[model samples]
Target: DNQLCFALYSANLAMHKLYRGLLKALDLTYPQYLVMLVLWETDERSVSEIGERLYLDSATLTPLLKRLQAAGLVTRTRQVIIALTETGRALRSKAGAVPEQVFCASASSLDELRQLKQELEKL
Candidate 1:
């Protein structure tokens, strides 16, 4: 019998692939995109804050954040604050719509998926 776990893994892999292909033009990887997502919600957040919100630790976030800074998507300052650049802000508008745009490309709609997820157990 087919297992639910495999189905979920397959779906997740497909989603990752879609993101990779779509974001290649932007020079972003999946991990980098996650960092940008945190910055989008809050312009200047400390490394700790991003870690807390994203459930990552400095060991992981430090390097990833640095890459974002190097890419000019964000800036890490002497004060140890991480903030978005103007480029990052403008990219936010495009990235913000990306999930939906990707969904539309797959001929999927979010409305029913959201409703279905509402029935799931949540902490």
Candidate 2:
């Protein structure tokens, strides 16, 4: 019998390709977008807070956060609080279209996607 793991891997790869094109225009990688998404939802957050939310360790997240900071999209305080810059706030308008575009491009229905998300989270 065939395994499901390859199917998931293939699907993830395809999804990454789709996101790469979409995110490229905004000067973000998939991981960077994830970080920005978290920042968009709050005023300011600690590095640890962002790390916990993203399931990333400081070692992995710090450089990513630093790149964003260099892009003038974020500010990282010595106290470790992360906040979006004005440019980052403006970028939100463009970034806001990503989900809808991805949804439109998806083969699955909204309900199906939601169910899949719930199931995957349980895994």
Candidate 3:
């Protein structure tokens, strides 16, 4: 016997991997882009704020940030802070087009995905 409820778990896992992998095309990893977007919206944010917003913890979040620092996309301080470097701003001009560039080739209509989104977020 087959069950839709079981299929839901498999589909959910598929999307999780697919979307996270797809984000690599932007030169911004999924979590990487998430931090950039948040700090782009608000320049001066604490470790706590970014972590809370993105549902990340300092252990996982800190290393990504350090890599961002080494890449010069962000700078860090002993105060446990994060701020963008000039290259970070430049990255936005290039990377902001990412969604429009990649997501247009949908096998399903946008609304269907939106409804799919609603169902998941509604969870």
Top candidate when judged by TM-score against the true structure: 2
Error of 2 at 109 (Å): 4.4
Off by over 4 Å in 3: 1-26, 97-123
Total clashing pairs for each candidate: 0, 0, 0
Stretches of candidate 2 off by over 4 Å are: 1-4, 97-123
lDDT of 2 by residue, 1-123 (tens): 223455555555666675677688889887888788788777599999999988999999988998899999999887589998999888888866654345335635434444445556645
Candidate 1 lDDT by residue in tens digits, 1-123: 334445445555655776776578678887788778777767788888888877988899888987888888898886378989998888867665654334435624434333334444241
Model 3 per-residue lDDT at 31:
67
Q: What is the lDDT of candidate 2?
A: 0.75
**Each model's TM-score?**
0.68, 0.74, 0.63
Candidate closest to the true structure, highest lDDT: 2
lDDT string for model 3 (10-107, tens) is 55455446566555655666667768877777776788888998899899999889778877888887547789989987777765464433433432
* lDDT (Cα, 0-100) at 52 in candidate 2: 93
